């Protein structure tokens, strides 16, 4: 229900930083699907890797390892 939180000006700013010139109407709604799909496909595996250690709180190293196994390595977050 909170998926509408990402403000239209916010996504507009992000795309402007990406190097665009004009944003049509439907793209603002359509970006939500991509964001949700990527976030879900990350968080599910992250939580699985977290639970495999019989812990209870999500650890940053768990997210790093999951992203690496997801094929996107982001070095810097410890």
């Amino acid at each position: 229900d909170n998926i509408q939180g990402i403000t239209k000006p916010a996504i507009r700013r992000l795309a402007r930083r990406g190097g665009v010139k004009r944003i049509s109407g439907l793209i603002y709604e359509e970006t939500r699907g991509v964001l949700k799909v990527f976030l879900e496909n990350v968080i599910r595996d992250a939580v699985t890797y977290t639970e495999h250690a019989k812990r209870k709180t999500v650890t940053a190293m768990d997210v790093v390892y999951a992203l690496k196994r997801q094929g996107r390595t982001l070095y810097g977050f410890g």
């Binding site: 595996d45 699985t48 890797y49 495999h52 250690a53 390892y65 196994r69």
Partner: protein
């Protein structure tokens, strides 16, 4: 000399699958390649997870976690569904 393969096991499983099917030698080769690739991927994931948890030996729980991590989607839900039922049989002793 001699080399290892899974030809006999593959043939037996295929006979179990259907009693009226043929296949070529190249098909057996492709099947052997698929089997080896999947086994290697599973072993690598297991070793990495074990090192991450900083334990010392591989136990079936780690294998189950890796299988849940690797295989694509709902098929794994069926696949793992066999394994415990498989494991219980050995647990049947």
């Amino acid at each position: 000399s001699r080399k290892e393969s899974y030809s006999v096991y593959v043939y037996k499983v295929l006979k179990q699958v259907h009693p009226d099917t043929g296949i070529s030698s190249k098909a057996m080769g492709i099947m052997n390649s698929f089997v080896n690739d999947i086994f290697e991927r599973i072993a690598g994931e297991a070793s990495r997870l074990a090192h991450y948890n900083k334990r010392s030996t591989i136990t079936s729980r780690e294998i189950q976690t890796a299988v849940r991590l690797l295989l694509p989607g709902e098929l794994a839900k069926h696949a793992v569904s066999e394994g415990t039922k498989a494991v219980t049989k050995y647990t049947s002793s």
